Symmetry: D2
Subunit: 168 residues, 4 copies
């Protein structure tokens, strides 16, 4: 009965801008290795986090595999790192799965790749890990130091941020 | 909810100076992290100290408490050295003046301006904790929330641990 | 007659991978501000270096403007930061201009953008600045910790480096 | 020409350690810069010391001289602390054993592992200097080549300057 640190959070990675990295062959960026693993490596965690790579790019098949992976996890606190362009569509899909009803599921990512100077990625990862641990069960987007309801959120391209959709 | 951030120095903020041939407490690293965070909402940062957290007196903790009480915000982050973080947190937890606020202390084991630092992760985690936790005083480090009354720094592990 | 530090090196910037940076609007890299200025800012220079931006991308017109700028400089030590894909063509062009005959002219750049993690850029800039100051008059490519003769150099794409062309 | 790199410690190599609550001389930063330099040619790196350059004795300088003499390479870079860089350089310049070699000393005013360091620029500049300069001993810092016999560190400027 010595103390055992639990590992209540599992992270799944689905690619996106957060993970982009330069390749000579492409003369540009590709979706690379998961940047969340780099951030957690130096986080001096008390426990650990289980990080599972799902994809590196989006068909209903791809969202369905994500829902299967999230639903089959033993953990009830889940972070999914993802591209911002279809994050709302994935989040809305996950919110329709009854098997997620007792889980806190947070999607996050970055507007700037983690491997590019001046990125929001490390901040967003810390914020989203906490959100996944602390929010009540449901599906959320955590970006810009804010929690978003997927049914009432859109990307504002001129602003470069997600914004809430006001009730009419 | 608007977040108020206070900076009290510590390892997180250390930076190299030629004159000292070593590290000193420099400008608050939380401002560098939040500059690139693309924040959607209400934040402001206030400097309180750059003094060594080992050199904080009961008078210094009383002045930090009064400064946090000056904020009308009910969500507070205080960046601080880890050496006496538990002493400041326990002091703040005893002030009836702060009872409606969520106050989170955080910092870093490695300076933000040194390679391989925990600082940016800790700032994001602690900002969320200050917005989401119920009223009280907490330490947010190591991807965990600690109760100050039941926490110590374990120098053998280089981490806070529960008592 | 107190000591005055000379500024014998002038730098011209013509863009390339070295200067690439992420933009939200593009969802990828563009040619950004000159990365050589960022490196020299923290170099604690004894003197200074004059950095002039020429272009951010290549027509004979573009090479001709570069030759005009280099030939009109008062300095006899010149570094041009440039993309690696046509560096040999620019260098060979400059080597044909008699008005450059007393100048040491070095071209350099980076295989990885300076603003991406793990870049060769800062090393290449320090190496190329020294090369421009120390080599005898002529036109050179300085990359990979090596000096290349433009008439006897090609990019080896499989290798990701310039290589010499052996005499037959 | 093959370059041999020797590492004698100094600010360039400093890194943060929890146990010290500050910087110590860590692993050689020149190895980190050259790992990403995509080098075309012949290089090797040899560790000599992590001892404080202020604490180098005449015996230590004699041992650095003998170590540089063990290299068959005629192009040498020695990374070193700036406090006694001029003393080591002047000592090496007097060794007839080294007369055919180009030996360049360099380092950094800011540790390579601290943000805003001169280290990577200084390493690239000093590698080129070691390949290109005529036989002799030099200091390569601040984008300049210094003659050790005619150089001092000006602590008021934070730069080497000619005498
Ligand atoms: Cl791209
Ligand atoms: Cl220190």
């Amino acid at each position: 009965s010595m103390a055992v640190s639990p590992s209540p959070l599992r992270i799944f990675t689905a690619g996106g801008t957060i993970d982009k990295d330069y390749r000579l062959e492409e003369n540009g960026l590709v979706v690379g290795d998961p940047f969340v693993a780099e951030v957690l490596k130096t986080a001096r965690l008390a426990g650990a986090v289980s990080i599972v790579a799902l994809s590196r790019k989006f068909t209903e098949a791809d969202r369905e595999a994500i829902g299967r992976a999230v639903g089959q996890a033993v953990e009830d606190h889940i972070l999914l790192t993802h591209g911002t362009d279809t994050m709302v569509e994935t989040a809305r899909y996950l919110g329709g799965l009854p098997e997620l009803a007792g889980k806190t599921v947070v999607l996050s990512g970055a507007m700037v790749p983690g491997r590019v100077g001046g990125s929001d990625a490390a901040f967003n990862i810390g914020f989203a890990c906490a959100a996944a641990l602390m929010l009540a069960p449901g599906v959320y987007i955590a970006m810009h130091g804010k929690v978003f309801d997927p049914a009432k959120t859109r990307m504002n391209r001129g602003l470069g941020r997600f914004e809430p959709i006001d009730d009419q």
